[PDB]
Design a protein around this ligand. Structure first.
Ligand code: HEM
Ligand SMILES: CC[C@@H](C(=O)Nc1ccncc1)c1ccccc1
Length: 421
């Protein structure tokens, strides 16, 4: 019957899959450039209906699980798995502590790799806040390294089959087994050498036979799941926030002055990370607009819908793209330029473009972790920027993301040098 508009190219074995695995943003932009607000590309044996623009995005984000389901939209997660405002102050204090612990051995000056640093830091902030400080204290660099391998195991080939015999998938499975072993060791460690946390709660549950209900494997899967949403997103966002501050010294200087003035009231990071830090918040908003951690959002249609005359049927993959929508020229003047001022009271481009400023989604599925993520950035930089001065150790334009996996991560090198203030 009727065929939806299809983007050019995709003449490879799996259609546009190979291009999606190399330059997904370019592919999605070409879909919009050639077809408009509703266009398709072929992801192996699956047609993806890519929606963009306010009108189409509104349909996407206002749709409940009854119309567009996310349940089976991400097959790459199956092998991997196998927030209260009142607690926010406590989490801010926890994050401050974790950052100070991470930079405790920095000394007077040195060099760091952003991916390595923030990936490890966010493993500690996430585990400490979500599972418990007790659990985080039993973790070290090994956990972060293994967790990284899990994220690297999200090749788009998962849309063909999540268990293909490729190196990244093999490393993904090996990494998960390694995490189970680490968790099993922690459990055994508590038996021999007794504030209780989530792990203690799970260990205490008994089966209908008196035996422990949960195995190290089941517990590990729960913990992986609890930490996955916020890890790669917060890690990447922290890295890009620092990169953009260094790329734009005027913003860097403004944030520094602001931080010094604000903390002059003598209140802690747990107080200030939950309150306005204007310049930093606008730099963060702009960083998220330009470098949204999730470049594409997927759904599986559960019924028949029509968007601008185009028909969507049950079973069809439907997607929205923060990467593309966040840069629509009509909605964001000079979309490729770093302009924190676009979020100040006069313009408020994030609030005005309810359906296209979507680094945190919109509508019914709006990010429930956004408040936590924003607080975390404020807490992290409140510490880092007041303690140290940062400079780029490589050309500004050489910092870039690796888009070869569904989980976007910073490519290396991403070297930065620091010196005590
Ligand atoms: C900078 C960090 C983060 C970014 C950029 C981000 C982005 C997003 C986006 C784009 C959506 C919409 C997804 C969709 O419509 O398919 C979303 C939803 C959501 N996020 Fe995040 N997120 C971040 C951190 C977190 C954290 C820390 C948590 C965990 C506490 C989290 C939990 C969720 C949940 C549960 C939803 C769905 C809410 C619902 O369906 O009602 N996010 N996030
Ligand atoms: C579970 C991983 C999944 C996701 O929903 N992540 C997610 C992260 C933060 N907040 C909400 C969802 C995803 C989707 C596309 C690309 C990479 C990973």
């Amino acid at each position: 019957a009727v065929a939806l508009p299809r983007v050019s190219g995709g003449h490879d074995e799996h259609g546009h899959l190979e291009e999606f695995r190399t330059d997904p943003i370019g592919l999605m932009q070409r879909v919009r450039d050639e077809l408009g607000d509703v266009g398709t590309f072929q992801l192996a044996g699956k047609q993806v209906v890519l929606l963009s623009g306010s009108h189409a995005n509104e349909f996407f984000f206002r749709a409940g699980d009854d119309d567009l389901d996310q349940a089976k939209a991400y097959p790459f997660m199956t092998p991997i798995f196998g927030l209260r405002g009142e607690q926010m102050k406590g989490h801010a204090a926890t994050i401050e502590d974790q950052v100070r612990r991470m930079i405790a051995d920095w000394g007077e000056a040195g060099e760091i790799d952003l991916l390595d640093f923030f990936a490890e830091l966010t493993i500690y902030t996430s585990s400490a806040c979500l599972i418990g400080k007790k659990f985080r204290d039993q973790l070290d660099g090994r956990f972060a390294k293994l967790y990284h391998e899990l994220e690297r195991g999200t090749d788009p080939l998962a849309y063909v089959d999540p268990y293909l015999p490729i190196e990244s998938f093999r490393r993904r499975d090996e990494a998960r087994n390694g995490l189970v072993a680490l968790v099993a060791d922690i459990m055994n460690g508590r038996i021999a050498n007794p504030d209780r946390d989530m792990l203690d709660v799970l260990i205490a549950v008994k089966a209908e036979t008196g035996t422990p209900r949960f195995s190290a494997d089941e517990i590990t899967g729960m913990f992986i799941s609890m930490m996955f949403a916020g890890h790669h997103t917060s890690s990447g966002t922290a890295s890009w926030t620092l990169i953009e501050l260094m790329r734009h010294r005027d913003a860097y200087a403004a944030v520094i002055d602001e931080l010094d003035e604000l903390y002059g009231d003598g209140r802690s990071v747990s107080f200030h990370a939950l309150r306005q830090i204007p310049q930093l918040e606008n730099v963060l908003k702009e960083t998220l607009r330009l470098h949204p951690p999730l470049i594409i959002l997927m759904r599986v249609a559960k019924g028949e819908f029509e968007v601008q005359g185009h028909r969507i049927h049950e079973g069809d993959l439907v997607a929205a793209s923060p990467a593309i929508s966040n840069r629509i020229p009509e909605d964001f003047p000079d979309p490729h330029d770093f302009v924190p001022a676009r979020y100040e009271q006069p313009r408020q481009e994030d609030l005005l473009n309810r359906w296209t400023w979507i680094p945190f989604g919109a509508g019914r599925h709006r990010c429930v972790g956004a408040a936590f993520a924003i607080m975390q950035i404020k807490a992290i930089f409140s510490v880092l920027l007041r303690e140290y001065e940062f400079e780029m150790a490589q050309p500004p334009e050489s910092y870039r993301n690796d888009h070869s996996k569904m989980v976007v991560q910073l490519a290396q090198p991403a070297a930065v040098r620091y010196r005590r203030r």
